[PDB]
Design a protein around this ligand. Structure first.
Ligand SMILES: Nc1ncnc2c1ncn2[C@@H]1O[C@H](COP(=O)(O)OP(=O)(O)OP(=O)(O)O)[C@@H](O)[C@H]1O
Ligand SMILES: Nc1ncnc2c1ncn2[C@@H]1O[C@H](COP(=O)(O)OP(=O)(O)OP(=O)(O)O)[C@@H](O)[C@H]1O
Ligand SMILES: Nc1ncnc2c1ncn2[C@@H]1O[C@H](COP(=O)(O)OP(=O)(O)OP(=O)(O)O)[C@@H](O)[C@H]1O
Ligand SMILES: Nc1ncnc2c1ncn2[C@@H]1O[C@H](COP(=O)(O)OP(=O)(O)OP(=O)(O)O)[C@@H](O)[C@H]1O
Ligand SMILES: [Mg+2]
Ligand SMILES: [Mg+2]
Ligand SMILES: [Mg+2]
Ligand SMILES: [Mg+2]
Lengths: 752, 449, 172
């Protein structure tokens, strides 16, 4: 159905391109059974289909080695057809093939360098003498001989485009050489194959543009007008302009490009004149495609716009696309980042009827993108693209290209010892040795970050799950929360239940909430966005909710994402209690958050985590399941947790064996984690002081403390204090007890 | 142009996009455009003495036209080309489909009934999409890469009713294209309990459009306002989702603070245009989620801050009064803090109906637990009646999170068994009573007394 | 040979005075590439369609001479966020810059450098891979770094024996 246009349906004519052992530039060899199926005799001229509107003619031959589904081909014909090994091409007999009256050929600029003899005499004259080789325009064939082999490209064929080389046919090398860069650019033209992901979107695009031009008879028979307008919208980097390049490179219709601001001109009425000239030029050549890049630049809302020229341009576009005179077989495409900025009148059926959404690829999509990108790059055997696809979470396709470029740059960096910037040339052995390996991709993955999250990126102190002491059940629960919906979605589908996507940490100050957030940010396989509470608020009216909406939109784009509110009680407070706060701007912010976490829009894979010191003042609607589903209480550590905390802080520090951490944990009762860390830091400071005094004494004598001992810990302990008092403990335990009594039973057992 | 119209008489002058050439003079900041508007007024005055020339103009925005141009003697007669009703949509379909190769099974009256706000261009979009689907059905036999098509396939080409059903699933009015959100599939049996509220909503949405005749006979104008108020997690947004999916009336879902903008007058303009695009697509349901975000007690904004909230709520009350009774626009507001709502929006004539979504009862909790687990394999030994008994004060969200905790425990157990089997290589067909017991141990009431 | 196009965009960000324009000047003097300087506010003009034309002519002149480096100093003035700005000329100049950096016709050998004090004001579409390949952070120098800066500055001046640049680096 939808993907039916993309499938090749295994037609018999299409054949696998295969290396030809002994065929020349102008001949091809096929198996006997296939010719018997194709009724193609030996020595017959055929026409070969290719990608990017490329065709070539070759002499069919019989080869025993060639398979039924395969065609043996020279590299020359593949270059002419822009087809790699293994691509399927249709083969058909050339109709009314004629001998060439005259053929003009132009050699490549790089090859003719260093050729003392005449290019025509050394190469053209013997090769084309009794060659009887069919050729077509735009075909490049390599010719042996001389100090360097010279590639020759037949720019002009008479009769165009199919001709046979004959001895009486005139051959001449007169003319400017073909530029090597031009041939390379012709080689690197994107087609529908270079687009990765979005198979349905590509199918819809092909249905809009390719199908009417190929088969207008279908639409005439069904008697409808095929859609004429396409709007491609999506976040930056997903590939809208790449699809535009693909359409421009491999369509038969006329392609006219309009860049948004380019229309504007200083003279009054000149912008409308530019648009009218563009559409008139398209209509002159009948089947045409107009691509308006950055449409939102020149099509804003007429109500919103304050400038007369801009509104007149929008109205000009509206009348051009739909009016008394309708377009005669002209397709109009536009790509915009902000689809809502477009005037509503354009988004009607007459003008932009089909809106195709190019979205963020899923894991398989970005694997497909990676295969497309790296098919050209040199790769080792150790590189595994499934891993690189699974790791890159929110990448859109431009970010995957950035990852490839970073890996290649690191691979080149590894060879700076051999390579020299001062030297004008590099050894060929190094060039052979240079290839992108898996370690380069691992380093690139370490550096890589989505472009969408560039603004909301913060350096994180690099905590690991082993640095946190105690809280084992909370650790396992956070790991399950992040990992289960991502790594095991089929299980949830089997049980047919959506995951819970919210956690609230509340407890005494210094007990390990921000530390858990740091551990999640460093380790887990999900993007992290960290938010200070009051950072979103702004003095301007309606701007605070705009910031909230934008941050939740960023979280949705980069899903799976973790959204962390460091001090939730600053931004989510009970409504109606603020006398000032502007015009209830705090309440409006709370309402926007309430709508974003649970509203009409379908749930995506975004986890909201919040930390608070005072959970009582937080709005009751925020704590409702579906928003912050699970409330986790991070209590003051008990004795086992205190032992774990002291061991975790001291794992890097060299401490003497005589220090008994169990006794420290026993004596310190009610100490928060921060208090134990402060004890360790004070002991460290006393040791540093002792080292300084010993060094000063030694310096004085001229003109210690290898590890922390028990006396330092004794001094640090006499300086120590309890940070959280009993009133605070009581109020947190009171909130917990209110929840526990709300439960209605400590234990629940089904009747037997 | 006017001279050539005068030379050849009788004649018609058509001015397309009138608002483009004739904006308000006081709004315009360019000398040339003011001169052009004055020239248009003068040329209308001259047209008054012209005998056989009549000018006709078309505008998407009737308001942007200069009010002087709407004065008597200049564009005296204004014709409002409104959206068609059911009979009009059927007529448009019959006219469009005269050339198409329709099959015998298709009947256009059903298609006309299905569409609600389509303006005649959306109907053409629907026809084109159906034809495209019909062509897609034939693309297995014929390929795009092929150069010629068999005549048998060409004779096979015809639009069936499956194609119009597909198009109707895909279709959407152009006006609503600006404001559309993906809404999860929710159906009426997904909601547990609240049967009276379900029936009331179905009545209030269906009766005025289906049978206006009874209401006009009895001289009662139907109520066009509903307010949903209750504890958090009881099913207001859920009812809105169900109405969006199931009911046959256009749905506009909007967050509260999304209308507001820092620029002067933008918030009022947004309110006006949203109510406008609600009118253009009647019958339409306009749902204000978190209503207390927009409508708060008057005078607080003026006291502290810019005070644009008061102007926004005044604009909303004005637009609520402006819409006519015959027009089918039903306004639903959801809130869990009804006390801070401005009483002016509860005044009779605006949001007349107040529905209280209560904290679910025992039978309600049984219905909720049954509805949540309909798609999940659950052991027969699991007793939902006992769960409803024990959770006296739980709301719907709490019961849902109990079931989700049971599901998560099941997933955890399956993963442990899988890891055990994999480790020895180098379980849980359904949720049991143990998972529900542990989930209930983790349960807690969301709403205090 | 490795098979990738080399990076073609740079953004230098840091607090004022760190040396972004100094690095731009060093790259300009030290390279055999045609260097074109663009100042942020120098582009824009009152007339409609002239600022976009200035950008187009700048990039066209860079295209004609290859290889080329374009340095847009104070990019934050010329490229604010299109969501936030109200004026149309700013949004259209941002769109023109976007289409010039990465569009249907891609710059073959032009490398665009830009220095900005506040990077977050830049339009998020410009910070994408294609436009500005990566962002280089010129930060406040450390003790050794500021000692190196002192040695570079003081080599030209005449210095008596008693001067100790080590201590001068320590005090600042
Ligand atoms: N599907 C894809 N497959 C392969 N490469 C892709 C794909 N999508 C994007 N790219 C890569 O991203 C770049 C093309 O991005 P493109 O110019 O299409 O973005 P865009 O949608 O126009 O963005 P912007 O919003 O900035 O206009 C190229 O480097 C291309 O290799
Ligand atoms: N369980 C723990 N294991 C190890 N270190 C801990 C633990 N709890 C607290 N700390 C220490 O506490 C310090 C940071 O405290 P943290 O950020 O976790 O506090 P918090 O609960 O977010 O408090 P606040 O109320 O101030 O926001 C670090 O020095 C960290 O080592
Ligand atoms: N009666 C019910 N039947 C089924 N599910 C329900 C019911 N009530 C609540 N739920 C569940 O809880 C959620 C419904 O919450 P909803 O958004 O409707 O609440 P609300 O009344 O708008 O509250 P809030 O004040 O939090 O916005 C969904 O996840 C749904 O599965
Ligand atoms: N790393 C450095 N080494 C040596 N001199 C430096 C260094 N950084 C700055 N300077 C000196 O400081 C001067 C000012 O630096 P520069 O003009 O590059 O500032 P900037 O960061 O570009 O500022 P702006 O915010 O105005 O763009 C330089 O001309 C140079 O004399
Ligand atoms: Mg683009
Ligand atoms: Mg903290
Ligand atoms: Mg709700
Ligand atoms: Mg500078």
């Amino acid at each position: 159905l939808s993907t039916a246009i993309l499938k090749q349906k295994n037609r018999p004519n299409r054949l696998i391109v295969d290396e030809a052992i002994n065929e020349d530039n102008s001949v091809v060899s096929l198996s006997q059974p296939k010719m018997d199926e194709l009724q193609l005799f030996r020595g017959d001229t055929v026409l070969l289909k290719g990608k990017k509107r490329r065709e070539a003619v070759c002499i069919v031959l019989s080869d025993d080695t060639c398979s039924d589904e395969k065609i043996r081909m020279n590299r020359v014909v593949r270059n002419n057809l822009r087809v790699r090994l293994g691509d399927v091409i249709s083969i058909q007999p050339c109709p009314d093939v004629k001998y060439g009256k005259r053929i003009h050929v132009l050699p490549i600029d790089d090859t003719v360098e260093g050729i003392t003899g005449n290019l025509f005499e050394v190469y053209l004259k013997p090769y084309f003498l009794e060659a009887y080789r069919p050729i077509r325009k735009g075909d490049i064939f390599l010719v042996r001989g001389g100090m360097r082999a010279v590639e020759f490209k037949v720019v002009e064929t008479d009769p165009s485009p199919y001709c046979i080389v004959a001895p009486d046919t005139v051959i001449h090398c007169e003319g400017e050489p073909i530029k090597r860069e031009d041939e390379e650019e012709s080689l690197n033209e994107v087609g529908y194959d270079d687009i990765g992901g979005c198979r349905k979107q590509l199918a819809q695009i092909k249905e809009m543009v390719e199908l009417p031009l190929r088969h207008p008879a279908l639409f005439k028979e069904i008697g409808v007008k095929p859609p004429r307008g396409i709007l491609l919208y999506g976040p930056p980097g997903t590939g809208k302009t790449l699809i535009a390049r693909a359409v421009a490179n491999e369509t038969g219709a006329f392609f006219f490009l309009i860049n948004g601001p380019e229309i504007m001109s200083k003279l009054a009425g000149e912008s409308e004149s530019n648009l009218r000239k563009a559409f008139e030029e398209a209509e002159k050549n009948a089947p045409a495609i107009i691509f308006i890049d950055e449409l939102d630049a020149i099509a804003p809302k007429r109500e919103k716009t304050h400038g007369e020229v801009e509104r007149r341009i929008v109205s000009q576009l509206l009348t051009l696309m739909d009016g008394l005179k309708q377009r005669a077989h002209v397709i109009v495409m536009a790509a915009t980042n902000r689809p809502n900025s477009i005037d509503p009148a354009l988004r009607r059926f007459g003008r932009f009827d089909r809106e195709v959404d190019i979205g963020i690829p899923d894991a398989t999509g970005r694997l497909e993108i990676l295969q497309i990108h790296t098919k050209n790059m040199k790769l080792a055997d150790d590189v595994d693209l499934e891993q690189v696809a699974n790791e890159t979470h929110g990448h859109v396709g431009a970010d995957l290209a950035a990852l490839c470029s970073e890996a290649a740059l690191q691979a080149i960096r590894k060879k700076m010892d051999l390579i020299d910037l001062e030297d004008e040339t590099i050894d060929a052995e190094v060039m052979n040795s240079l290839a992108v390996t898996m370690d380069d991709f691992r380093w690139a993955l370490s550096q890589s970050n989505p472009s969408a999250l560039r603004e909301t990126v913060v350096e994180v102190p690099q905590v690991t799950w082993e640095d946190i002491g105690g809280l084992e059940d909370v650790k396992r629960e956070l790991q399950e929360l992040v990992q289960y919906p991502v790594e095991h979605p089929d299980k949830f589908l089997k049980f047919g239940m959506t995951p819970s996507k919210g956690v609230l940490f509340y407890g005494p100050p210094g007990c390990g909430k921000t530390l858990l957030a740091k551990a999640i940010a460093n380790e887990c396989q999900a993007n992290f966005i960290s938010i200070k509470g009051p950072e979103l608020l702004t003095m301007w009216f309606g701007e605070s909710e705009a910031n909230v909406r934008e941050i939740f939109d960023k979280a949705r784009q980069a899903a799976p994402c973790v959204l962390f509110f460091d001090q939730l009680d600053s931004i989510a407070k009970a409504r109606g209690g603020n006398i000032g706060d502007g015009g209830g701007a705090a309440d409006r912010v709370i309402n926007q958050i309430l709508t974003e976490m649970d509203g009409m829009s379908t749930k995506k894979n975004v986890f909201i985590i919040g930390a608070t010191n005072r959970p009582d003042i937080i709005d009751p609607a925020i704590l409702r399941p579906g928003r912050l589903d699970q409330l986790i209480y991070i209590p003051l550590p008990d004795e086992k947790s205190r032992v774990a905390i002291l061991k975790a802080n001291l794992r890097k520090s060299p401490v003497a064996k005589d220090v008994d951490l169990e006794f420290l944990a026993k004596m310190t009762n009610g100490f928060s984690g921060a208090d134990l860390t402060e004890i360790c830091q004070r002991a460290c400071k006393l040791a540093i002081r002792e080292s300084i005094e010993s060094e000063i004494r030694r310096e004085r004598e001229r003109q210690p403390v290898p590890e922390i001992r028990r006396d330092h810990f004794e001094e640090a302990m006499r300086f120590a204090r309890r940070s959280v008092s009993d009133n605070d403990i009581r109020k947190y335990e009171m909130f917990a007890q209110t929840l526990q009594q709300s439960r209605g039973f400590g234990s629940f057992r089904f009747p037997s």
